[PDB]
From a paper:
Here, we discover a family of Bdellovibrio proteins that define a new subgrouping of the lysozyme superfamily and demonstrate that they possess outright specificity for deacetylated peptidoglycan. We solve the structure of family member Bd0314 (that we named DslA), revealing adaptations to the lysozyme fold that sterically restrict the active-site cleft into only accepting polymers deacetylated at the GlcNAc positions. We determine a role for DslA in B. bacteriovorus exit from the prey cell and demonstrate that exogenously added enzyme is able to prematurely liberate predators from prey bdelloplasts before completion of the predatory lifecycle. The architecture of DslA is related to, but significantly different from, other members of the lysozyme superfamily but still fulfil the inclusion criteria for the lysozyme superfamily noted by Monzingo et al. — conservation of the β-sheet floor and helices D and F, with appropriate placement of acidic catalytic residues.
The lysozyme superfamily has a conserved ES motif at the C terminus of a central α-helix, which is readily identifiable as E143/S144 on DslA helix D. Residue E143 of the conserved ES motif would act as a general acid, protonating the equatorial linkage between MurNAc and GlcN, with E154 acting as a general base to activate water to attack the MurNAc C1 in an axial orientation. The structural equivalence of DslA E154 to the β1 secondary catalytic acid residues of goose-type lysozymes (also GH23, but with a second catalytic residue lacking in the lytic transglycosylases), v-type lysozymes and chitosanases, and our assay on the E143Q and E154Q mutants argues for an inverting hydrolytic mechanism for DslA. Additional controls were performed using EDTA plus DslA with one of the catalytic site residues inactivated (E143Q), or using conventional hen egg-white lysozyme (HEWL) or buffer only. The percentage of prematurely released, external predator cells increased significantly when early bdelloplasts were treated by exogenous addition of DslA, whereas no significant change was detected for the treatment controls DslA E143Q, HEWL or buffer only.
Author numbering: 0 to 181
The structure:
Amino acid sequence: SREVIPLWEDKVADGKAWSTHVYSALDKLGPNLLDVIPADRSLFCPKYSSLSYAQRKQYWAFVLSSMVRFQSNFKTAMSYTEDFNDSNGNRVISRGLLQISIESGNAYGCGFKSTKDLHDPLQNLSCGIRILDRWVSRDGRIAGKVDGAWKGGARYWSVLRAGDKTSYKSIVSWSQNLSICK
């Protein structure tokens, strides 16, 4: 009786298993995320404050799938060499569905043992829950720039940072037009 279905279920063979993992991992890794009433709800989900717990898990699984859509187009094997360095002076390699890197990701407690673990879709999605759980809850908002500093998920993901990008405008549009949000 879900009202909102994540985009990875449309094409990905394991898409339903990904959703089941996210719904369960949200209980364990996103309890702070799911207690926030975000200050930019008027932008992302106008009716956020009336969502049940189950609807908020449906919402965050959808938003994660919309980020995956533009980060990796659902390709868990994807890697991308960035413009900047890790602390050792090697260019950062972003990996997997949400394009997380091992050094910055492991700072969230994601516990990646090796780079191969970032291409494990379940570990990758769990890490993205951890990142959101930290910053959406600390900043009290999903994204946006407040007094010259990016907030919420935009702290980590440039795909959530406002601008004239198809990715950002689509994530915003898809979120705010979910039946449970509008």
